[PDB]
Amino acid sequence: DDIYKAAVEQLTEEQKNEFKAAFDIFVLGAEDGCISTKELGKVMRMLGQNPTPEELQEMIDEVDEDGSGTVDFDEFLVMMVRCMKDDSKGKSEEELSDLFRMFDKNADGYIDLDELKIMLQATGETITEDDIEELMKDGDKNNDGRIDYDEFLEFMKGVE
């Protein structure tokens, strides 16, 4: 949602309206309340795009923690956005080593959620806490309560 809600912030009302209707007819031949392969393919072969039932349902699995289970209007649109050339690819690992390192205020190579949340206080803006512990888990896939550089990487996904 983080990436996703932050995204819906940008594009305006009319973008929202056009893809709502684009779903209202993306169900012109719908499948599952979500969109299983028939409408997806329908709309695509109307032009020629290539989503496959398998990876359809998989990128769904990547996202259907909501309980869409298959390509809902949400997945229809995340597919939509999964194509437009806008941005990706990860502020420098050298940069990121620095960024870890300042998370590694301690000058160690291992960071608990404490000086990390203190980096966050150093960010100051309205601090969420759920997402703080979530980010602890993101990083500490090592799960050692303290976080290394690549854990920090696992902790700062999709970030500028």
Partner: peptide, 12 residues
């Protein structure tokens, strides 16, 4: 976008 949206594509 063009070939199947035409001049209707202005803001959205």
């Amino acid at each position: 976008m063009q070939a199947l949206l035409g001049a209707r594509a202005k803001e959205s």
